[PDB]
Design an enzyme around this catalytic site. Structure first.
Site: not given
Ligand SMILES: [Zn+2]
Ligand code: NA
Length: 181
Positions: A87, A92, A56, A58
Protein backbone atom coordinates in the site's frame (compact mmCIF):
# COMPACT_ATOMS: atom_id res chain seq x y z
CA UNK A 1 11.56 -23.20 10.74
CA UNK A 2 7.81 -23.15 11.39
CA UNK A 3 6.07 -23.83 8.10
CA UNK A 4 2.72 -22.34 7.09
CA UNK A 5 -0.49 -24.36 7.02
CA UNK A 6 -1.58 -25.25 3.46
CA UNK A 7 -5.00 -23.73 4.01
CA UNK A 8 -3.42 -20.44 5.05
CA UNK A 9 -1.25 -20.44 1.95
CA UNK A 10 -4.07 -21.22 -0.47
CA UNK A 11 -6.55 -18.79 1.09
CA UNK A 12 -4.03 -15.93 0.90
CA UNK A 13 -1.97 -16.45 -2.28
CA UNK A 14 -4.98 -17.10 -4.57
CA UNK A 15 -5.03 -14.55 -7.41
CA UNK A 16 -8.70 -14.98 -8.39
CA UNK A 17 -10.43 -11.58 -8.06
CA UNK A 18 -13.61 -13.23 -6.79
CA UNK A 19 -11.82 -14.55 -3.67
CA UNK A 20 -12.04 -11.84 -1.00
CA UNK A 21 -9.07 -11.45 1.33
CA UNK A 22 -8.42 -7.74 1.73
CA UNK A 23 -8.13 -8.02 5.54
CA UNK A 24 -4.73 -9.74 5.58
CA UNK A 25 -1.36 -9.99 3.84
CA UNK A 26 1.17 -12.80 3.98
CA UNK A 27 4.79 -12.02 3.17
CA UNK A 28 7.25 -14.87 2.59
CA UNK A 29 10.87 -13.68 2.51
CA UNK A 30 14.35 -14.96 1.80
CA UNK A 31 17.71 -13.25 1.83
CA UNK A 32 20.81 -14.04 -0.18
CA UNK A 33 24.23 -12.44 -0.13
CA UNK A 34 25.77 -11.49 -3.47
CA UNK A 35 29.51 -12.30 -3.67
CA UNK A 36 31.51 -12.16 -6.93
CA UNK A 37 28.48 -13.01 -9.05
CA UNK A 38 27.39 -15.99 -6.92
CA UNK A 39 24.72 -15.88 -4.23
CA UNK A 40 25.18 -17.22 -0.71
CA UNK A 41 21.69 -18.45 0.18
CA UNK A 42 21.02 -17.78 3.86
CA UNK A 43 18.38 -20.29 4.96
CA UNK A 44 18.48 -19.06 8.55
CA UNK A 45 17.06 -15.75 7.22
CA UNK A 46 13.87 -17.11 5.62
CA UNK A 47 10.39 -16.92 7.07
CA UNK A 48 6.98 -15.40 6.63
CA UNK A 49 5.02 -12.55 8.25
CA UNK A 50 1.39 -11.43 8.30
CA UNK A 51 -0.25 -8.19 9.42
CA UNK A 52 -0.54 -8.01 13.22
CA UNK A 53 -2.68 -5.60 15.25
CA UNK A 54 -2.85 -2.92 12.58
CA UNK A 55 0.81 -3.15 11.56
CA UNK A 56 1.25 -4.26 7.96
CA UNK A 57 3.52 -7.20 7.15
CA UNK A 58 5.84 -4.96 5.13
CA UNK A 59 6.56 -2.76 8.15
CA UNK A 60 6.97 -5.87 10.31
CA UNK A 61 9.66 -7.02 7.85
CA UNK A 62 11.45 -3.70 8.18
CA UNK A 63 11.12 -4.14 11.95
CA UNK A 64 13.18 -7.35 11.84
CA UNK A 65 16.00 -6.31 9.44
CA UNK A 66 18.38 -5.38 12.31
CA UNK A 67 18.00 -8.85 13.80
CA UNK A 68 19.21 -10.30 10.48
CA UNK A 69 22.62 -8.73 11.22
CA UNK A 70 23.43 -7.74 7.65
CA UNK A 71 26.96 -6.49 7.03
CA UNK A 72 26.73 -3.03 5.39
CA UNK A 73 30.06 -3.82 3.73
CA UNK A 74 28.21 -6.58 1.82
CA UNK A 75 25.39 -6.65 -0.76
CA UNK A 76 22.16 -8.58 -0.15
CA UNK A 77 19.11 -9.40 -2.25
CA UNK A 78 15.88 -9.70 -0.27
CA UNK A 79 13.00 -11.42 -2.06
CA UNK A 80 9.36 -10.98 -1.00
CA UNK A 81 6.57 -13.27 -2.12
CA UNK A 82 3.70 -11.09 -0.91
CA UNK A 83 0.01 -11.84 -1.27
CA UNK A 84 -0.87 -8.16 -1.92
CA UNK A 85 1.30 -5.45 -3.46
CA UNK A 86 2.35 -2.87 -0.82
CA UNK A 87 0.00 0.00 0.00
CA UNK A 88 0.73 3.71 -0.10
CA UNK A 89 -1.89 5.27 2.15
CA UNK A 90 -0.91 3.38 5.33
CA UNK A 91 2.80 4.01 4.84
CA UNK A 92 4.36 0.83 3.40
CA UNK A 93 5.64 2.18 0.04
CA UNK A 94 7.06 5.27 1.75
CA UNK A 95 8.79 3.28 4.50
CA UNK A 96 10.26 0.75 2.03
CA UNK A 97 11.51 3.63 -0.11
CA UNK A 98 13.20 5.31 2.87
CA UNK A 99 14.62 1.96 3.99
CA UNK A 100 16.19 1.27 0.60
CA UNK A 101 17.57 4.83 0.51
CA UNK A 102 19.23 4.41 3.93
CA UNK A 103 20.35 0.81 3.23
CA UNK A 104 22.06 0.95 -0.13
CA UNK A 105 23.56 -2.47 0.57
CA UNK A 106 20.06 -4.04 0.22
CA UNK A 107 18.30 -4.85 -3.05
CA UNK A 108 14.62 -5.76 -2.91
CA UNK A 109 12.66 -8.06 -5.21
CA UNK A 110 8.88 -8.02 -4.71
CA UNK A 111 6.62 -10.64 -6.29
CA UNK A 112 2.95 -9.98 -5.52
CA UNK A 113 0.07 -12.42 -5.99
CA UNK A 114 -2.45 -9.56 -6.51
CA UNK A 115 -2.45 -5.75 -6.79
CA UNK A 116 -3.80 -3.95 -3.70
CA UNK A 117 -6.13 -1.62 -5.60
CA UNK A 118 -8.32 -1.05 -2.55
CA UNK A 119 -5.79 1.73 -1.96
CA UNK A 120 -6.66 4.77 -4.12
CA UNK A 121 -2.92 5.45 -4.46
CA UNK A 122 -1.90 1.86 -5.38
CA UNK A 123 -0.32 2.99 -8.66
CA UNK A 124 1.84 5.51 -6.80
CA UNK A 125 2.88 2.81 -4.30
CA UNK A 126 4.09 0.62 -7.18
CA UNK A 127 5.89 3.46 -8.95
CA UNK A 128 7.45 4.57 -5.68
CA UNK A 129 8.85 1.05 -5.13
CA UNK A 130 10.20 0.90 -8.71
CA UNK A 131 11.75 4.34 -8.33
CA UNK A 132 13.50 3.24 -5.11
CA UNK A 133 15.18 0.35 -6.93
CA UNK A 134 12.78 -2.48 -6.03
CA UNK A 135 12.04 -4.92 -8.84
CA UNK A 136 8.28 -5.49 -8.73
CA UNK A 137 6.48 -8.26 -10.59
CA UNK A 138 3.41 -10.51 -10.39
CA UNK A 139 3.64 -14.07 -9.10
CA UNK A 140 3.39 -16.74 -11.78
CA UNK A 141 2.82 -20.49 -11.41
CA UNK A 142 6.56 -20.92 -10.90
CA UNK A 143 6.66 -18.65 -7.85
CA UNK A 144 3.44 -20.04 -6.32
CA UNK A 145 4.83 -23.56 -6.55
CA UNK A 146 8.17 -22.45 -5.17
CA UNK A 147 6.39 -20.82 -2.22
CA UNK A 148 4.34 -23.96 -1.61
CA UNK A 149 7.52 -26.05 -1.72
CA UNK A 150 9.54 -23.68 0.48
CA UNK A 151 7.24 -22.11 3.10
CA UNK A 152 4.28 -24.53 3.49
CA UNK A 153 3.79 -27.59 5.71
CA UNK A 154 2.87 -29.59 2.65
CA UNK A 155 4.08 -33.11 3.63
CA UNK A 156 5.28 -33.82 0.12
CA UNK A 157 1.93 -33.05 -1.44
CA UNK A 158 2.53 -31.29 -4.78
CA UNK A 159 1.27 -27.80 -5.41
CA UNK A 160 -2.20 -27.99 -6.93
CA UNK A 161 -3.27 -24.84 -8.78
CA UNK A 162 -6.61 -23.16 -8.46
CA UNK A 163 -8.78 -22.58 -11.50
CA UNK A 164 -7.53 -19.68 -13.57
CA UNK A 165 -4.14 -19.27 -11.90
CA UNK A 166 -2.21 -18.60 -15.11
CA UNK A 167 -4.88 -16.40 -16.73
CA UNK A 168 -5.21 -14.13 -13.69
CA UNK A 169 -1.43 -13.93 -13.28
CA UNK A 170 -1.01 -12.79 -16.91
CA UNK A 171 -3.83 -10.21 -16.69
CA UNK A 172 -2.32 -8.86 -13.48
CA UNK A 173 1.13 -8.76 -15.03
CA UNK A 174 -0.21 -6.71 -17.94
CA UNK A 175 -1.79 -4.21 -15.56
CA UNK A 176 1.38 -3.98 -13.48
CA UNK A 177 3.67 -3.44 -16.43
CA UNK A 178 1.28 -0.80 -17.80
CA UNK A 179 1.47 0.97 -14.43
CA UNK A 180 5.26 0.73 -14.28
CA UNK A 181 6.08 1.48 -17.96
ZN1 LIG B 1 0.69 -1.32 3.88
NA1 NA C 1 10.77 -0.41 13.51
Amino acid sequence: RYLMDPDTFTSNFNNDPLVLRRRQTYLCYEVERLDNGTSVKMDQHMGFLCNESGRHAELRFLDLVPSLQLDPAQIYRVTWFISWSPCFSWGCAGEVRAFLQENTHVRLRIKAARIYDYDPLYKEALQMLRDAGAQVSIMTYDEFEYCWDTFVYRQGCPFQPWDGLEEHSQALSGRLRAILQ
